[PDB]
Design an enzyme around this catalytic site. Structure first.
Site, mmCIF file in Angstrom:
data_model
loop_
_atom_site.group_PDB
_atom_site.id
_atom_site.type_symbol
_atom_site.label_atom_id
_atom_site.label_comp_id
_atom_site.label_asym_id
_atom_site.label_seq_id
_atom_site.Cartn_x
_atom_site.Cartn_y
_atom_site.Cartn_z
ATOM 1 N N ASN A 252 -10.515 25.764 30.864
ATOM 2 C CA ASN A 252 -9.188 25.884 31.503
ATOM 3 C C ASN A 252 -9.244 26.428 32.973
ATOM 4 O O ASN A 252 -9.526 27.344 33.303
ATOM 5 C CB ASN A 252 -8.245 26.954 30.915
ATOM 6 C CG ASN A 252 -7.018 26.780 31.287
ATOM 7 O OD1 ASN A 252 -6.765 26.373 32.474
ATOM 8 N ND2 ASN A 252 -6.100 27.106 30.457
ATOM 9 N N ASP B 87 -9.391 34.115 24.516
ATOM 10 C CA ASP B 87 -9.289 34.187 23.099
ATOM 11 C C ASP B 87 -8.268 32.844 22.675
ATOM 12 O O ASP B 87 -8.666 32.271 21.658
ATOM 13 C CB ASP B 87 -8.643 35.353 22.704
ATOM 14 C CG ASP B 87 -9.555 36.461 22.916
ATOM 15 O OD1 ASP B 87 -10.757 36.477 22.626
ATOM 16 O OD2 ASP B 87 -9.061 37.663 23.529
ATOM 17 N N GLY B 88 -7.205 32.557 23.322
ATOM 18 C CA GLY B 88 -6.305 31.258 22.900
ATOM 19 C C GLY B 88 -7.162 29.950 22.822
ATOM 20 O O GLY B 88 -6.595 29.215 21.891
ATOM 21 N N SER C 93 -7.246 36.328 30.510
ATOM 22 C CA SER C 93 -7.007 37.837 30.758
ATOM 23 C C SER C 93 -7.365 38.592 29.514
ATOM 24 O O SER C 93 -7.437 39.684 29.586
ATOM 25 C CB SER C 93 -5.335 37.942 30.877
ATOM 26 O OG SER C 93 -5.002 36.961 32.093
ATOM 27 N N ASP D 169 2.209 41.545 24.393
ATOM 28 C CA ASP D 169 1.445 40.118 24.728
ATOM 29 C C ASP D 169 2.689 39.233 25.300
ATOM 30 O O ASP D 169 2.196 38.365 26.295
ATOM 31 C CB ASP D 169 0.704 39.699 23.561
ATOM 32 C CG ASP D 169 -0.341 40.354 23.264
ATOM 33 O OD1 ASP D 169 -1.238 40.100 22.066
ATOM 34 O OD2 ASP D 169 -0.987 41.162 23.980
ATOM 35 N N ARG E 213 0.316 37.121 34.180
ATOM 36 C CA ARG E 213 -1.019 36.633 33.988
ATOM 37 C C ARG E 213 -1.714 36.915 35.351
ATOM 38 O O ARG E 213 -2.999 36.931 35.299
ATOM 39 C CB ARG E 213 -1.176 35.186 33.654
ATOM 40 C CG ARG E 213 -2.421 34.780 32.873
ATOM 41 C CD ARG E 213 -2.305 33.345 32.118
ATOM 42 N NE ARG E 213 -2.393 33.318 30.681
ATOM 43 C CZ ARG E 213 -1.376 33.409 30.081
ATOM 44 N NH1 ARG E 213 -0.260 33.492 30.419
ATOM 45 N NH2 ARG E 213 -1.473 33.448 28.711
HETATM 46 O O1 LIG Z 1 -2.567 42.996 23.554
HETATM 47 C C1 LIG Z 1 -1.911 44.145 23.488
HETATM 48 C C2 LIG Z 1 -3.101 45.304 23.342
HETATM 49 C C3 LIG Z 1 -2.744 46.600 23.396
HETATM 50 C C4 LIG Z 1 -1.460 47.055 23.511
HETATM 51 N N1 LIG Z 1 -1.239 48.351 23.696
HETATM 52 C C5 LIG Z 1 -1.272 49.209 22.803
HETATM 53 N N2 LIG Z 1 -2.172 49.495 21.777
HETATM 54 C C6 LIG Z 1 -1.917 50.629 20.897
HETATM 55 C C7 LIG Z 1 -2.770 50.552 19.974
HETATM 56 C C8 LIG Z 1 -3.426 51.733 19.707
HETATM 57 C C9 LIG Z 1 -4.201 51.937 18.482
HETATM 58 C C10 LIG Z 1 -4.766 50.837 18.022
HETATM 59 CL CL1 LIG Z 1 -5.994 50.734 16.694
HETATM 60 C C11 LIG Z 1 -4.457 49.457 18.318
HETATM 61 C C12 LIG Z 1 -3.463 49.497 19.357
HETATM 62 C C13 LIG Z 1 -1.013 51.325 21.225
HETATM 63 S S1 LIG Z 1 -0.086 50.721 22.772
HETATM 64 C C14 LIG Z 1 -0.280 46.127 23.750
HETATM 65 C C15 LIG Z 1 -0.945 44.584 23.715
HETATM 66 MG MG LIG Z 2 -4.121 34.291 24.341
#
Ligand SMILES: Oc1ccc(Nc2nc(-c3ccc(Cl)cc3)cs2)cc1
Ligand SMILES: [Mg+2]
Ligand SMILES: Nc1ncnc2c1ncn2[C@@H]1O[C@H](COP(=O)(O)OP(=O)(O)O)[C@@H](O)[C@H]1O
Ligand SMILES: Oc1ccc(Nc2nc(-c3ccc(Cl)cc3)cs2)cc1
Ligand SMILES: Oc1ccc(Nc2nc(-c3ccc(Cl)cc3)cs2)cc1
Ligand SMILES: Oc1ccc(Nc2nc(-c3ccc(Cl)cc3)cs2)cc1
Ligand SMILES: Oc1ccc(Nc2nc(-c3ccc(Cl)cc3)cs2)cc1
Ligand SMILES: Oc1ccc(Nc2nc(-c3ccc(Cl)cc3)cs2)cc1
Ligand SMILES: [Cl-]
Ligand SMILES: [Cl-]
Ligand SMILES: [Mg+2]
EC number: 2.7.1.91
Lengths: 342, 349, 344, 349, 346
Positions: free
Chosen positions: A14, A73-74, A104, A170, A177
């Site tokens: 891409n 990943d998409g 990203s 997300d 982006r």
């Molecule tokens: O694609 C994304 C990835 C992480 C986040 N942010 C956050 N992840 C968490 C979180 C904490 C523990 C686990 Cl096992 C997974 C995610 C808390 S805030 C938001 C969007």
């Molecule tokens: Mg994606």
């Protein structure tokens, strides 16, 4: 479990999302290594949406030794679903696949870099290492999640299904982006500073207790009696994850690579302070977030799950791609496709 | 890196074998472990075992809800009984999730040695090892571990947290129990003397390597009844003459036996080693000694074979062969096993 | 390349072919060895021609690790055609087979015994050796001959296709089935005394010039043979013999060059004009594989991948793996490594 | 055992290199061969053939119909020229059926040494070997032999009646030519000297084992172009470091080198040997020495592999490798071959 | 389900135990059965049966579509294996409907003997008996038969076509093997020996008499609950023997149930209670040859028709004979299923 030498590979790249540099990076960081390894390739640029999916669905797969996906990943989500939509999906899904990071969200690539023993590198170091994995030609099998929606849509997941906090970031993250990997950080910090909660019903089949999803009953049915119905109906996030990493700097599953036919399930129940979540998020970079005493973060290894958002539609992210629904369940199939890896 | 924590403060049941550290587990607990617990605000109660299956029967009937963890102070043997006791319970699916902890007193402390290794510590022994494992308990971090499900020719089903050995290793273990007082050097003795009184073992080994897996208690879906041939996608080893067979889930075979220096096992995976007949004593001794620093692999003996497996079957071939299971003697005609991923939790760091 | 241990095997045994002792032989010479090797068996007895073929055509093949055929070459002929007549023929024909000698013609078991290194043994010695081969469980691929008849029949040969002297002896011989191997000897002396020749045309495709499987080398019988084929000028013969193995029977080492390569068969023919005494020399020399050491311009040997044969005077009598077949023309192509046999 | 016969009486063309046998080939013809031909009623005509490709160009243009056999008196090298001369002909399919006979002069007589062995004689050398091969020709028996078809990276296609060697064996055939005056012992001296700087060679070897085959001149159906990878049902060897690779169609590598004692090649099959890097000098020498009595297989040295094959590919890493084809030097980036069953006929017994 | 006849012509699988009719089964077949089949246009294929359970695995994996019926030429124990094999298939519901046929070879042919009786023939033996059952098969008529569903304390679920025996009968079946080489006669010699050693066995017996996945046994309650309140719990806790019997004969020369052929879903329950004299027990055994044993009205011999029963051996364990096959347990119970499978009969 090794690619032929010499071999040939289709590189579905891409040229835009993430940075607009995917093609130049291929040229400076991927190509020189391919040449020394005697991997000739053909580049196909993916224009827009479902382009990749439709290409793969119609492709004469016999001309290729592997398919390499250079984006995020998409794209890999697109490629695997295209192979799964073909009449000949059973043999088609056994075509070897490889993920080179540019986008990203490079969670799959970050995961495979982890399994190969590397440090948690980022960007161009991450690309180079993933490229080195391709050049050594070794393949291993990977789990596949089979999903099912409220409206009878089957889709496949290779990385994750997310709901609540994660799906929100997300979604809202896309308007940067531009920030790269960092877009999820800004996107979390601000959702976290203005934290909220979501309402649903989680159920799963733990490890203790198209292909047929033998473990699943129609979404209309109640789950079987032997499943676990989560008492809570108030979450900050629900997350099914098939790999070690959520992003190149989010070591979200520190127990490492999943066993065959097993997924990681996490959930944060409602009640956590924002300061705890931050502390946790931050800890996740080094995969230290479980080292913290927090009855709100629950972890379980599972083969199946169902999530029903209470009151109309929840926003879901499948391999980082947005999806609107009111009900999805899914079952993990073991060792269902080949990836390059070390 | 850790995947859970004990609460702070917490309460812990301590199962101790008094005839251990040979004869002085209790005094070691008192000098080396208690004062550290007190500062970590870990409450404990000591229960004394001694007799066979006692610890197993206790863990089987225990009300597990009163404890945040079970600390087992003794050898690999005692961890074996406890895990098998939890698995034998009607509520095994929830009981196997009680965090467990290994504090080395007994003769063979390969489990404690491995975990000390995972944590980044030097290869220490005796009370340095006891202090390290207690420090881990004080830091409270938990990791999931694999469990081997075993089946014998007689229809017994049993679990193994560490190892299944047959051949030289199994003999030297069983023999060596006399020189147990000599502490861990008891295995160097046995190995030296048996390496001169070498005998070989006839039997059939098959296994399922990781790469070749397609699409009461848990079911071992990879296994077929012992009177059936193995599935065709398994490797059936040509050679039927052996010095040893070893299934091992961990890095260490003893506090000074870094047997598996390739990395830590992935979830649902264990190490398989066998030594085919006709090796020279001196090469077998160099393998042993190099094992202490985990340099035995560096030698490519093409008599020594290693393979990451998810299941195995082993049939001696001339009557009820002699096996050691996590150090404990067991005899039977044939044995096979499958690994289950991350089935129980241990303190580690 | 190797059967499972333990394993289970279907034995199709013809209880009265040859001298009619197959079952007691199995009991005396075979069973003790299978018990030691951990091979369970079930015996099915055959009742008549095509019985074996029908059982195999409808058989549930997933219950069995191999099929053992304890008879002559004819039973193996029937078993293999049985598998080729099935809709799942492509996987079916991959079931391993094993031949235990207990008819009067045991060419295939004699060839396998030869490939395994043993001497040219007969009777129970042969039976013992072929059993020792099954007990050791090793497998290797064999060639298969695909045939087409004038009437548009499609059939398969594992061993031989013969016309002329040999086909006639096989048919006339049938009444001396009880004499084992001596059937072909007596049968041969008799035919020699009334030595006839037979008119026909033979073409073949030598190794150099190179629903079921596709016979890509073959064209409809009604069309002439590809320009690149050899059309033998001669048109009166004593015998034509396509042979996929080293032995023509347990005492006829007909192909002293040994085991064919993949995808290749031995084609022999004797031209009209040989004397009775020379044909008799060739025949007796053939016991020890010496018949090619004689200067005989009438005996011609070529390795081939295909052949066509038309008897010009009406219907010619053939023997296919020893089974009688009548026809106006036959052609065939050999396919490489098409099925598994127990051997060494 | 014979599969055909020469006519009696018959006539034969003898192609003789007067430079071979230290320049005594013609006098050895006269003393050891001629008197036997006379008694066997074999007429002959002698043609002297010493310059490069001379014998090849002769056989390419000859009217083969006037001879019952071509007999070649010199080494494997001249057999190699003759066979390639026949195959380069537009009527190669009938030309290659002219019976051929190999009469040993000088050294590099692996072909004559194998036939002498197939026939049941002792491993004799020099005049005794010549006499024996001559007595085979007088007995007139014929057997068909396998032929190796080769393709090089540069696009050359050639044929081999005996062997293709790379690494240590090829380097010694090459470095060895100077002591040609010493006869067969030059390979001993060459081996001994080259052992001192035992180097290894980097390359990639793949082959097609006999059991794994399923369903210009002749077509090489098992071979795909050198720039495509080998078919997936081939074995690619993991080691990329060798001391030698040898493809060998017969029992002998030389008149005192019974290299392939495991039995005569079936139609369409050849032997493949290689030696993985890391053997000691001494063990390489012992394997060499044991080769005199065909006993080198008895050491089960783990570094020496033997496999029956129908095709192979070998690609030196690091530009051009030095190969020996039927003892003659050839240099190339990559070579692959497959065996053709029973393609030509030779006198033998 | 369906009609009680075979197609003509038809083809039949014959499971023959060669080690039967003392090593004569196959020759019996050749001289006694084959010419009858050929005249009736019954095609057959013979398959021989070595080890224990071999017939059962064979029937469980068999492509039933090739055969119009399965004939068993052995004893009752082979029929037992065949039925249990059909009942273990995923497709047990259709598989159990394949008609069966029972040709006697050597000892232990209660089933064959019953069929010959129901047919109206005289009580014959050996080759006369083999000929009659073969005539049955040539006539191609079928009847439905009862099947007994058995459950054991260990969670074992099996099926019986003829009988569950315990006490004196089971011991004689066991102890009998050490001279099976004697034939049907050996039951008589075992009987004579056990008799001089006459003992009782401890047990608790309960049944449901006629008056009041796998198939559902709705009369049965789990082996841990007490029996439902309407069942008859027998007071005796000491027995010489207990016998569930689905047919008229216990052997070719043992007419054990002369009160009439069992109706759909009924089985015979017999027992002998503690206290009978040896000479009496033996009188019962001998008179049972011509079916005259009930005429004694010996108070120790109890008979009832039942649909379900429970037996709890309480001298630790008990050995049973199930269709003459040996088996050992602390607790078994069963329920007759009516007209559950087809058998050649007249
Ligand atoms: O694609 C994304 C990835 C992480 C986040 N942010 C956050 N992840 C968490 C979180 C904490 C523990 C686990 Cl096992 C997974 C995610 C808390 S805030 C938001 C969007
Ligand atoms: Mg994606
Ligand atoms: N029970 C049987 N009775 C009569 N003929 C049979 C029987 N079973 C098979 N046949 C047929 O008899 C023929 C001769 O068998 P074959 O195995 O060729 O023995 P031989 O070596 O004596 O020719 C075969 O065509 C076979 O199908
Ligand atoms: O508990 C025991 C451990 C080791 C031994 N003896 C020996 N082990 C070995 C050995 C070598 C290689 C491996 Cl990978 C493992 C063990 C050589 S000698 C005996 C008892
Ligand atoms: O089954 C049979 C086999 C051989 C014969 N008889 C004869 N065969 C031959 C013969 C000669 C040469 C060859 Cl290569 C083969 C067979 C001559 S006589 C008859 C029946
Ligand atoms: O023409 C030559 C033949 C052999 C050698 N030297 C050597 N050959 C060997 C060797 C060992 C084993 C085999 Cl199977 C073949 C060759 C060892 S050293 C050199 C030149
Ligand atoms: O002190 C010396 C040692 C070796 C030599 N030279 C040579 N050694 C060899 C050789 C060959 C085989 C072996 Cl194992 C060792 C040395 C060949 S030439 C000369 C002086
Ligand atoms: O298979 C066997 C059959 C009968 C016997 N013995 C005896 N049976 C009886 C008997 C009495 C009455 C009836 Cl209803 C049934 C059997 C008495 S003694 C032993 C083994
Ligand atoms: Cl390309
Ligand atoms: Cl079987
Ligand atoms: Mg025949």
């Amino acid at each position: 479990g090794v690619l032929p030498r010499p071999c040939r590979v289709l590189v579905l790249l891409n040229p835009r999302g993430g940075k607009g540099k995917a093609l130049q990076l291929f040229r400076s960081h991927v190509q020189p290594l391919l040449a020394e390894a005697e991997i000739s390739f053909t580049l196909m640029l993916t224009e827009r949406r479902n382009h990749a999916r439709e290409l793969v669905r119609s492709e004469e797969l016999g001309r290729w030794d592997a398919l390499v996906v250079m984006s995020g990943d998409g794209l890999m989500h697109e490629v695997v679903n295209g192979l799964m939509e073909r009449p000949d999906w059973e043999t088609a899904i056994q075509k070897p696949l490889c993920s080179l990071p540019a986008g990203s969200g490079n969670a799959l690539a970050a995961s495979l870099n982890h399994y190969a023993g590397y440090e948690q590198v980022t960007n161009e170091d991450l690309l180079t290492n993933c490229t080195l994995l391709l050049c050594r030609r070794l393949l291993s099998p990977m789990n596949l999640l089979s999903l099912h929606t409220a409206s009878g849509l089957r889709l496949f997941s290779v990385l994750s299904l997310a709901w609540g906090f994660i799906a929100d970031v997300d979604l809202e993250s896309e308007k940067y982006r531009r920030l790269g990997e960092m877009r999820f950080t800004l996107g979390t910090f601000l959702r976290l500073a203005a934290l909220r909660t979501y309402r649903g019903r989680l159920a799963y089949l733990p490890v203790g207790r198209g292909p047929v999803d033998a473990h699943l009953v129609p979404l209309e049915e109640p789950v079987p009696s032997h499943w676990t119905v989560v008492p809570d109906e108030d979450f900050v996030l629900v997350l099914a994850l098939l790999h070690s990493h959520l992003g190149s700097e989010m070591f979200a599953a520190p127990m490492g690579r999943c066993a065959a036919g097993v997924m990681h399930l996490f959930y944060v129940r409602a009640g956590v302070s924002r300061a705890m979540l931050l502390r946790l998020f931050l800890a996740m970079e080094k995969g230290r977030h479980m080292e913290y005493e927090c009855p709100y973060l629950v972890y379980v290894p599972v083969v199946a799950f169902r999530l029903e958002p209470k009151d109309g539609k929840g926003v879901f992210a499948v391999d980082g791609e947005l999806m609107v629904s009111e009900a999805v369940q899914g079952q993990v199939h073991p060792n269902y496709f080949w990836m390059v890896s070390g």
